[PDB]
Every structure is written in C-alpha cells, then in structure tokens.
Homo-oligomer: A and B are copies of this chain.
Amino acid sequence: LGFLGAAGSTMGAASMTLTVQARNLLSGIVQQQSNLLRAPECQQHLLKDTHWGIKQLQARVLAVEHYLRDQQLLGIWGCSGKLICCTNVPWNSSWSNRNLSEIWDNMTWLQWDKEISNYTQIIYGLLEESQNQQEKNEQDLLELD
C-alpha cells in the first residue's frame, strides 16, 4: 500500500504493513544522505555554510536517537526481534473497555492511539517490570537444572 498506505485501514489489516513502516526511518536516512553525497557541490555547502551543516547534523542525530529509543524499549520488554509480540501483562478495562472486535475490525490505529493515549506510560512501566521478573525466573530455572 506504500508508506502510511494503511493509515486509514483498520488495525487488523494495518498490521500486515508493519514492515513498511518499520523500515521507513533508517531507509530514508540512508537515501537522503546518498542524494547529498552524490552532489559534491552540496558536500562543499555542508562545510561552507556552518549553520546549514549544523542543522543537517542535528536532524540526523535526532532521527537516530529516536530510532534507538524505540528499539531499546522493545529490547527491555523482550520484543527486540519482533514486529508483533505478546507479553505477560494483562489488559486493563480501565485503559479501555471497548469490544475487541471493534478495536481490530472497525478502528484504525490513529483512532486507537487516541483511545488509549493517557495510559502509554503505565503500560510501558508494566512491561518493563514483567520482563525483569521473567528474566530472573529464567536464570533460576537454569541454576535449578
């Protein structure tokens, strides 16, 4: 469907394009930098114009930092290798008590993010604790055997 082609799709259907969205950040970084590297005069511009050169580095550094921040969160939650991962944290009806079929078949991800936008930090804290406990349990199983 293309980048954000699934934005108006319902969540269920939209999940089949997670790869499209996931790659867009670093792919875009290397292609944009390539267009810049392919123009020797533009490279001269990066040094000739101090402010422009700084603005470009700032933008690139920030883009990398955001990529990594999200990757670390997946890492600490035990989802580093997955686009889709299930965890051991139960869903709270206080975050949302909406019917599961509406959530996946009628709603889009944009609507959904709004639906639960004030619980993000709660869920993330819970995911962190759950994974921490799980890893300790795994070590105990290995010491036991």
A 11-63 contacts with B by CB, 8 A = 15-16, 18-19, 22-23, 26-27, 29-30, 33, 46-47, 50-51, 53-55, 57-58, 60-62
A8 on the interface (CB 8 Å rule)?
A: no
Per the bound structure, the CA–CA distance linking A71 and B117 in Å amounts to 30
Min Cβ gap A90→B in Å is: 15
B-side contacts of A65, CB under 8 Å? 26, 29-30, 33, 60, 64
Cross-interface CB contact of A57 among B27, B54, B81, cutoff 8 Å: B54
Q: Which residue of B lies closest to A60 (CB)?
A: B61
B-side contacts of A82, CB under 8 Å? 135
B-side contacts of A78, CB under 8 Å? 81
Q: Which residue of B lies closest to A57 (CB)?
A: B57
Q: A26-B68, A30-B69 are in contact. List 8 more A-B contacts (CB 8 A).
A: A16-B136, A18-B132, A19-B76, A30-B66, A46-B58, A50-B54, A57-B58, A84-B138
